[PDB]
């Protein structure tokens, strides 16, 4: 984990999808 | 000259892209006169002709490739003459191999423009046979090279007029139901995009 580390792009896209998945389950108007 | 409304093009979501299932860059190209799109074509008219259009393409290609092999062999005999007339007199073989490398370059470039024309015509055919509207063309050459041969089969344009014609030539309840179905069945981010 210290030679490979952690990217940024993938994490951004992932938390994005996660946000729009926790927002569609209840109510989706996030902006 | 017709023109569109930025409010429904630039602001996210771009309503036009969503209505038509596009990306903006494509559309900012089609409206600011960069790429071309296909307003409509005929699928049943292009059905009973694919065979003979292949026939004409293939006869043209056999023609040019017969000329291509003729190029190869004729340049090769000229090269043999060049060597035989370069050695009969009193010169080293260093200069002979240099001039023969030049002649090799010659035959190479001949066969090269040859095969370049091959690949061009072949990709052109492969683009004709694979035609559905809303396709972009960043080329301006492929497009013209299709407008001269069979252009009258399909219909093309660019600008506000292209999107206009298209919108007119676009079923809506079919898309709406297919979208309801992609949402029902599909899942993931794809579900969200269809939503």
From Swiss-Prot, chain B:
Belongs to the RNA polymerase beta' chain family. This is DNA-directed RNA polymerase subunit beta'. The RNAP catalytic core consists of 2 alpha, 1 beta, 1 beta' and 1 omega subunit. When a sigma factor is associated with the core the holoenzyme is formed, which can initiate transcription. The chain holds residues 99 to 293 of 1317 of the full protein. DNA-dependent RNA polymerase catalyzes the transcription of DNA into RNA using the four ribonucleoside triphosphates as substrates. The gene is rpoC.
């Amino acid at each position: 984990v210290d030679l490979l580390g952690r990217n940024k792009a993938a994490d951004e896209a992932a938390e994005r999808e996660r946000r729009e998945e926790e927002a569609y389950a209840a109510g989706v108007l996030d902006l | 000259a017709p023109v569109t409304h930025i409010w429904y093009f630039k602001g996210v979501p771009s309503r036009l892209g969503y209505l038509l299932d596009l990306a903006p860059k494509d559309l900012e190209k089609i409206i600011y006169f960069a790429a071309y799109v296909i307003t409509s074509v005929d699928d049943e008219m292009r059905h009973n002709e694919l065979s003979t259009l292949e026939a004409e393409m293939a006869v043209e290609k056999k023609a040019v490739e017969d000329q291509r092999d003729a190029d190869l062999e004729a340049r090769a005999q000229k090269l043999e003459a060049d060597l035989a007339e370069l050695e009969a007199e009193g010169a080293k073989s260093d200069v002979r191999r240099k001039v023969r490398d030049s002649g090799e370059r010659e035959m190479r470039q001949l066969r090269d423009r040859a095969q370049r024309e091959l690949d061009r015509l072949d990709e052109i055919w492969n683009t004709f046979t694979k035609l559905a509207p809303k396709q972009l063309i960043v080329d301006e050459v492929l497009y013209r090279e299709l407008q001269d041969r069979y252009g009258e089969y399909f219909t093309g344009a660019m600008g506000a007029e292209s999107i206009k014609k298209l919108i007119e030539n676009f079923d809506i309840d079919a898309e709406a139901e297919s979208l309801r179905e992609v949402i029902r069945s599909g899942k993931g981010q794809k579900k969200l995009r269809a939503l």
